[PDB]
DNA sequence: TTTTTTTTTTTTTTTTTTTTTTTTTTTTTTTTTTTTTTTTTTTTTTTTTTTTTTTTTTTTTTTTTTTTTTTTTTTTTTTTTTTTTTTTTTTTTTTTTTTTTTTTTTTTTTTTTTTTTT
């Protein structure tokens, strides 16, 4: 949800990981970075999911 | 106004314990030295027809010393018991998976101050 409402689209240039962490952290999630970031790095690499 | 009782932290330095620097013994690790395997070719060894004079088996008969034989008494064999080792259920502990809670370190760069050595 913080990736598209930033607008991280596919078809989009890429933007910082600092950037959507940050996001997610100060609005939607309350648990702090370095756990989201784990989440995001293991569903962006391709022989987890 | 002078004088009298009591209380504790310090002059403490010494005894006990703890912490921190040390170096003998069995378990790792790199080296040299000896067991394995594949090619060349090479004189050398070795596979297969022909002839040949040989020397051991099969007609026949003989005996004697190993094959018959019965029996006493041993002694290896088997029985029970118990100990030692092997092997497998049982239990315990530890590790990895993915979202969470917490933290901790090493260096550049300059300029100024402490803090030891000569």
């Known amino acids: 949800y913080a990736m ?4 991280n689209d596919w078809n989009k240039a890429y ?6 962490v ?7 999630h309350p648990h702090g970075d370095s756990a989201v ?4 790095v293991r ?3 391709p022989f987890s999911l």
């Open 15 to 20: 933007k910082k990981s600092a950037r959507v």
């Open 37 to 40: 970031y784990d989440t995001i």
């Open 43 to 45: 569903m962006a690499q």
């Open 4 to 7: 598209n409402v930033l607008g």
């Open 22 to 28: 940050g996001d997610v952290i100060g609005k939607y």
